[PDB]
């Protein structure tokens, strides 16, 4: 009757399964630079923006014409294995990727079709730039908490190959232009999937509590001043997280953060007093995998045995909108 | 403890507000045909597919370069008026349209930004071809039912102008081709928005109970045989609706159905024994407005005073996937 933060948290939602896919082909920022060099000379720009400003040494790409749906399918088969369950158990499949096969049908239906879901399985895509995978976990969680379903898949496959091809193309023939376009060269390919479940069905599995979102949609227009607005948004979101989840920075064991660039990350972590040792980072070798970044990093943490029962894990990012979301997993 | 269908239904979710926008410019199928005529002669095809096969006499288009977000904004301002509340009350805004402004940010954030939502307002797009507006109502409903929010906006703006321009272009210079492309000429422009609320906050407002989805994602590949699969999917979905909502066709007062074509509609209604007088249809003059079709038709019913307190209203469609959803409003 009297509201409390902890009231809105999910009580019976767990992570049964989690997997990622690393895209196979490494493209180093040096090889890209050698192709851009005549153009750096052209414009008389002496700076290695990628290596030096962004902090990206390499990214991964697909070896072939891999569609988002294919990449999400692969990650999803792995996450079912990780959960030890058959596709027949899945009552919901949400696709959260920025990369998209078609106008329609949803990417989710194509992935469902590949996996062979049953006729009871509800599917749809959620789009929300780099935060969508947290949005999709939350959406699934509400259905689980209510008993509408027992198991859900959240998936995300990202592909950047056509983006890099088109972009390098345009970065060979104006500086406003050449600058606007370098930022596509921080993106990477990859995929993640997660199987979520009612907790009684998966005793001892990691627990998803939910989280908070704040927005500054006044800034939907939109990097100097965008970092600043981002930080101010995150500040507010942290206040929300304190009010709902009871967060204090020092009581969290890991921060799984969406990454835009080494300096944006550096600024975030300084701003909030976070211990950098608690922030795993794949951006320098994998680039920014959009909304798949968070679960990939979470899956990598797991596979490295870097998580312990009881660990409080913070999932967060700042996305275009502007939006910011912060959610907690208790391993 | 013993499950029953009615257990999964929403108890405290209502429709506070509802509005639509008709796009202003009428393009009749005759004017289109006169431009296509040399090409009908060319291919030696004597049939008026649009007028005679599809049953479309006209559609609406925008008069200017209206983006999906602009159209959703307009409909959303109207639906707030209809609900008699300020934007500050909105805790969630979901955009469900097929038409989309950008890769990112979400269309939802752009609409939120235009309206001036508060920093507490969560936003994201849902994509699921023609059923997404029902998906977005369901998503909002779960948050409302739990108490996470008090008011939500679901919005959808559709624009087809560039589609028609590109399509007419290609339909002037091969029959497999010319045929594949005529189906874009059944689309129309328009917009809808709905304000949903916790029932205690809006005493006497129409009640959203929720609904059911079934899928046949084996057919995500995909018209002859697509109508057949559609009907078989809907049959199953009706069985689900009977098990959850207690539906029998004769106890429903209106059917608000997504429309693809006059024959697909005719086949559906015959197949299920529905009284055609209970199926309002705007397709012949407005075309298919995608996922906005359902709420537009619902808003038109309302404005015509065609609904009475206690009326059981069935919201449904068949979408690419294949998917089918069926939900109930009790006016
Ligand atoms: C520390 C502040 C960061 C704000 C950056 C916002 C831009 C983010 C991006 O453009 C992508 O990486 C992610 C996204 N689109 O959501
Ligand atoms: C009566 C059977 C109807 C099945 C038709 C499916 C195709 C539907 C469409 O392509 C659009 O109108 C709607 C959609 N994409 O969801
Ligand atoms: Mn290779
Ligand atoms: Mn006009």
Curated annotation (Swiss-Prot), chains A, B:
**Which Gene Ontology molecular function entries are recorded, alphabetically?**
3-oxoacyl-[acyl-carrier-protein] synthase activity; metal ion binding
Q: Answer yes or no on keyword Metal-binding.
A: yes
What Gene Ontology cellular component terms go with this record?
cytoplasm
Keywords in alphabetical order: Acyltransferase, Cytoplasm, Manganese, Metal-binding, Transferase
User: What does the similarity note say?
Assistant: Belongs to the thiolase-like superfamily. OleA family.
Q: Could you give the subunit structure recorded for this chain?
A: Homodimer. Weakly associates with the OleBCD complex.
What InterPro entries does the entry give? Answer: ACP_syn_III_C, ACP_syn_III_N, Thiolase-like
One biological-process term from Gene Ontology? fatty acid biosynthetic process
Broad EC category = transferase
EC annotation?
2.3.3.20
**Name this polypeptide is given:** Acyl-CoA:acyl-CoA alkyltransferase
Q: What modulates its activity?
A: Inhibited by cerulenin.
Q: Does the keyword Ribonucleoprotein apply?
A: no
């Amino acid at each position: 009757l009297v509201p409390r933060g902890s009231h809105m948290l999910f009580q019976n939602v767990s992570i049964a399964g989690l997997a990622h896919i690393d895209a196979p082909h490494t493209l180093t920022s040096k090889e890209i630079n050698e192709r851009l060099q005549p153009t750096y000379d052209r414009l008389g720009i002496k700076t290695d923006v990628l290596g030096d400003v962004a902090g990206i040494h390499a990214r991964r790409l697909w070896d072939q014409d891999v569609q988002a749906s294919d990449a999400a399918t692969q990650a999803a088969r792995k996450a079912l294995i990780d959960a030890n369950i058959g596709i027949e158990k899945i009552g919901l499949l949400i696709n959260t990727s920025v990369s998209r096969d078609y106008l329609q049908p949803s990417t989710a239906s194509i992935v469902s079709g590949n996996l062979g879901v049953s006729d009871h399985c509800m599917t749809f895509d959620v789009a929300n730039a780099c935060l969508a995978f947290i949005n999709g976990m939350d959406i699934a969680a509400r259905m689980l908490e209510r008993g509408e379903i027992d198991y859900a898949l959240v998936v995300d496959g990202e592909t950047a190959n056509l983006v890099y091809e088109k972009t390098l193309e345009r970065m060979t023939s104006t500086e406003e232009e050449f600058r606007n376009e370098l930022a596509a060269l921080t993106l990477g390919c990859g995929a993640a999937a997660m199987v979520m479940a009612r907790s009684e069905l998966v005793p001892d599995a990691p627990r998803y509590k939910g989280g908070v979102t704040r927005s500054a949609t006044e800034w939907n227009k939109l990097t100097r001043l965008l970092l600043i607005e981002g930080i101010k948004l995150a500040q507010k979101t942290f206040v929300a997280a304190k009010q709902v989840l009871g967060w204090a920075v020092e009581e969290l064991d890991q921060f799984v953060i969406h990454q835009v660039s080494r300096p944006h990350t550096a600024a975030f972590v300084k701003s909030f007093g976070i211990d950098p040792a608690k922030v795993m980072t794949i951006f320098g070798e994998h680039g920014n995998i959009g909304p798949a970044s968070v679960p990939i990093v979470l899956s990598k943490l797991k596979e490295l045995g870097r998580l312990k029962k009881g660990d409080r894990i913070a999932l967060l990012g700042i996305g275009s909108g502007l939006n910011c979301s912060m959610a907690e997993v208790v391993w």
